[PDB]
Amino acid sequence: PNQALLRILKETEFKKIKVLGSGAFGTVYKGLWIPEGEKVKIPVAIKELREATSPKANKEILDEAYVMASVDNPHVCRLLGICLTSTVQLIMQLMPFGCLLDYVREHKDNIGSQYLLNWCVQIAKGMNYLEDRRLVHRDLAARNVLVKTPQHVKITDFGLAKLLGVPIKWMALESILHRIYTHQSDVWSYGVTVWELMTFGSKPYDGIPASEISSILEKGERLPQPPICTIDVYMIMRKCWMIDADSRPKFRELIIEFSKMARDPQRYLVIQGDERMHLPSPTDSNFYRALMDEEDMDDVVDADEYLIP
Amino acid sequence: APNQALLRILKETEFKKIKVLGSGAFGTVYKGLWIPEGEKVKIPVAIKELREATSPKANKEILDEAYVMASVDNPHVCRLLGICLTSTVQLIMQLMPFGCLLDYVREHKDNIGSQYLLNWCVQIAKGMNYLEDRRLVHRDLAARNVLVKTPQHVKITDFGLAKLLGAKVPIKWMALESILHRIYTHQSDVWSYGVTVWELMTFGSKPYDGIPASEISSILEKGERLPQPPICTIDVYMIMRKCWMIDADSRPKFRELIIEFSKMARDPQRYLVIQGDERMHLPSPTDSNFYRALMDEEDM
Numbered sequence: 001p002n003q004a005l006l007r008i009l010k011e012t013e014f015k016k017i018k019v020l021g022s023g024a025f026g027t028v029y030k031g032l033w034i035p036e037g038e039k040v041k042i043p044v045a046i047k048e049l050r051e052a053t054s055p056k057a058n059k060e061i062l063d064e065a066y067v068m069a070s071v072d073n074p075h076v077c078r079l080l081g082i083c084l085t086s087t088v089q090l091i092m093q094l095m096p097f098g099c100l101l102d103y104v105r106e107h108k109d110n111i112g113s114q115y116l117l118n119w120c121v122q123i124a125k126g127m128n129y130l131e132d133r134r135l136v137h138r139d140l141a142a143r144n145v146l147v148k149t150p151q152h153v154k155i156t157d158f159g160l161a162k163l164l165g166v167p168i169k170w171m172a173l174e175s176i177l178h179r180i181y182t183h184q185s186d187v188w189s190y191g192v193t194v195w196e197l198m199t200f201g202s203k204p205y206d207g208i209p210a211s212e213i214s215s216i217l218e219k220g221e222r223l224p225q226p227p228i229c230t231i232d233v234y235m236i237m238r239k240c241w242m243i244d245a246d247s248r249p250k251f252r253e254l255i256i257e258f259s260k261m262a263r264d265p266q267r268y269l270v271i272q273g274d275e276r277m278h279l280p281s282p283t284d285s286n287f288y289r290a291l292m293d294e295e296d297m298d299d300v301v302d303a304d305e306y307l308i309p
Numbered sequence: 310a311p312n313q314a315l316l317r318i319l320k321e322t323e324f325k326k327i328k329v330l331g332s333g334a335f336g337t338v339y340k341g342l343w344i345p346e347g348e349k350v351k352i353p354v355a356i357k358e359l360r361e362a363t364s365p366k367a368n369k370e371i372l373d374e375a376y377v378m379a380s381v382d383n384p385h386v387c388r389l390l391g392i393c394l395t396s397t398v399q400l401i402m403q404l405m406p407f408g409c410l411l412d413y414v415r416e417h418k419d420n421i422g423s424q425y426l427l428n429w430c431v432q433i434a435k436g437m438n439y440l441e442d443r444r445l446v447h448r449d450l451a452a453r454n455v456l457v458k459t460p461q462h463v464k465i466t467d468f469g470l471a472k473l474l475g476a477k478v479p480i481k482w483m484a485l486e487s488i489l490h491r492i493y494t495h496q497s498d499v500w501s502y503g504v505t506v507w508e509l510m511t512f513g514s515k516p517y518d519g520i521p522a523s524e525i526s527s528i529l530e531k532g533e534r535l536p537q538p539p540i541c542t543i544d545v546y547m548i549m550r551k552c553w554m555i556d557a558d559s560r561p562k563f564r565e566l567i568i569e570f571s572k573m574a575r576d577p578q579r580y581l582v583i584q585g586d587e588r589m590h591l592p593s594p595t596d597s598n599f600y601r602a603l604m605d606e607e608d609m
């Protein structure tokens with residue numbers, strides 16, 4: 001590992017301020033980092049694991065943590081630091097905009113086709129990067145995509161489930177039945193995630209008990225077409241849910257298809273009031289970026305630095 | 310022709326000043342919040358409210374300059390982000406919580422090592438060189454006019470402001486030709502750079518302390534210069550003294566300065582002699598990756 005990537009924190013260095021929420025494995029807090037010998041308090045997100053862990057368990061966590069800290073893509077969150085208290089605490093960048101699911105729900109009457117397609121493209125790019133890095137997520141869902149700015153979303157919480165090993169309604173059939181997790185299983189989760197966005201944050205299979213999901217999937221039942229979706233979008237979602245995992249789309253393919261659609265969004269999504277929705281603008285984008293989202297957003301191949309000696 | 314997309318024109322409704330951070334010759338600086346339309350998140354910003362109200366005709370001039378200020382693109386130069394054409398004009402830029410370098414060095418007077426000091430010198434030279442490349446003269450380079458993004462990363466600020474608005478006069482930082490003839494050039498900026506380095510090397514001491522400002526050009530004309538700081542090896546002092554040569558063209562160029570300081574930054578304890586330097590905190594990759602990820606994601 002490159003160890004310098006993951007900061008090992010003293011307990012004295014940071015403080016938990018307010019619970020943001022809880023998930024399967026821990027509780028996430030808004031918090032502050034207090035650099036030693038400095039006056040400044042820097043906002044951070046802190047996760048505290050639910051169960052206390054032994055040193056040997058901690059070693060496993062730490063070793064995985066180095067890999068999580070090694071990610072470098074604009075569409076993927078990086079794990080920044082760890083504090084090895086009895087109950088392990090982890091540190092990452094704080095996203096004031098919160099998770100994408102909460103955002104789409106909160107903005108459900110004010111989100112247009114351009115943003116939705118753009119997010120689909122971005123999530124694919126992030127997932128593609130994880131695939132290239134041989135990292136399986138296992139918990140991709142709308143709750144697990146963070147909004148850096150409304151124009152910029154990032155994948156989060158990859159690797160956590162394997163480490164501390166159930167989001168049944170996001171899981172590929174082979175995963176539920178046999179505990180097989182692959183990139184192709186992540187693709188299934190991606191389809192569900194897109195369905196969540198397209199429905200402005202509806203719950204999938206709402207009212208159907210999780211224990212019963214594998215049964216319906218086996219009979220060929222799937223999530224229905226969201227009203228805003230043309231068949232072109234819905235067909236991709238259906239492909240994500242094919243039984244033959246190798247038959248599902250690749251993230252690399254998804255990036256291209258969603259990118260094509262994003263060039264003519266109203267052709268592909270039919271949304272009430274779309275004609276009057278806010279669209280991402282350069283002056284606006286440049287402003288957000290200059291203030292609090294400075295990272296290079298270009299694909300590696302399109303970056304100024306790609307070929308620059 | 311500046312890309313106007315680089316400067317955001319703000320409505321007074323978009324943002325608000327929340328707290329005073331400091332002040333300068335031309336305005337007062339606040340911590341502010343920008344609230345994006347249709348959002349509930351508040352985004353911290355820095356806002357400078359100009360001291361004097363301006364006309365609509367003057368505002369065109371300010372605005373014209375602002376486009377230029379917005380067009381800078383260098384890791385060591387601050388970029389103007391936005392403007393609001395209120396009766397007293399307000400300008401917006403990124404909040405830098407660490408404040409200015411001069412205050413920082415004064416506050417950390419007893420725990421700053423040679424590596425940081427030399428690195429700051431290099432970075433300031435880099436921003437100045439960039440300003441030169443852009444054909445921009447600062448006119449007010451000083452340690453107070455360098456902001457700290459993180460302790461490892463500093464950025465030049467307030468370039469062009471004095472030319473735009475000026476009718477306070479930093480005599481103790483000014484090249485002789487500037488004092489005598491109001492001539493400002495990249496080369497006069499170089500003189501100011503030398504003073505700025507002296508400020509850092511003294512941990513924020515005041516240049517020419519005990520000498521009134523009206524008397525400075527006299528002493529300069531007679532060959533007096535700022536003394537060697539006790540931490541500086543003669544090698545460092547020679548570069549500073551070069552910055553203050555009467556003949557502006559004899560003075561080093563920023564691009565030269567980048568090279569000399571970078572050399573020194575390679576073996577810092579050779580060039581600066583600091584008590585307990587061996588025990589001072591050093592910039593480390595770990596501290597740097599964490600700081601960058603939290604608060605300094607710009608390409609370097």
Ligand SMILES: Nc1ncnc2c1ncn2[C@@H]1O[C@H](COP(=O)(O)OP(=O)(O)NP(=O)(O)O)[C@@H](O)[C@H]1O
Nearest residue numbers: 020021022023024028045093094095098099143157
């Ligand atoms: N870096 C972050 N910044 C701001 N909010 C965050 C951040 N990370 C997580 N959250 C929020 O914190 C809460 C908890 O996250 P989390 O523990 O991952 O549970 P979850 O996403 O709801 N379910 P799951 O990830 O499947 O276990 C959620 O409200 C998240 O939206």
Ligand SMILES: O=C1c2cc(F)ccc2Nc2ccccc2N1Cc1ccccc1
Nearest residue numbers: 045046047077078079090091092157158160
């Ligand atoms: O919780 C983890 C985590 C913990 C772990 F031991 C292994 C993998 C993980 N995935 C992950 C991957 C990339 C970024 C962040 C995370 N986060 C979320 C988070 C961390 C810290 C604070 C709040 C939320």
Ligand SMILES: O=C1c2cc(F)ccc2Nc2ccccc2N1Cc1ccccc1
Nearest residue numbers: 355356357387388389400401402467468470
């Ligand atoms: O105040 C200016 C400024 C105003 C102006 F009308 C002309 C040139 C300027 N220089 C400058 C150049 C590059 C970046 C920032 C600035 N800043 C500092 C600042 C601006 C806005 C808020 C706080 C501080």
Ligand SMILES: Nc1ncnc2c1ncn2[C@@H]1O[C@H](COP(=O)(O)O)[C@@H](O)[C@H]1O
Nearest residue numbers: 330331332333338355403404405408409
């Ligand atoms: N972008 C900024 N972020 C935080 N503080 C700033 C910023 N700009 C200026 N300041 C502070 O305000 C003081 C005066 O600014 P100025 O008027 O430009 O001289 C500086 O010394 C800093 O303390």
Ligand SMILES: [Mg+2]
Nearest residue numbers: 023024025026
């Ligand atoms: Mg969790």
Ligand SMILES: [Mg+2]
Nearest residue numbers: 023143144157
């Ligand atoms: Mg989560």
Ligand SMILES: [Mg+2]
Nearest residue numbers: 333334335336
């Ligand atoms: Mg001022």
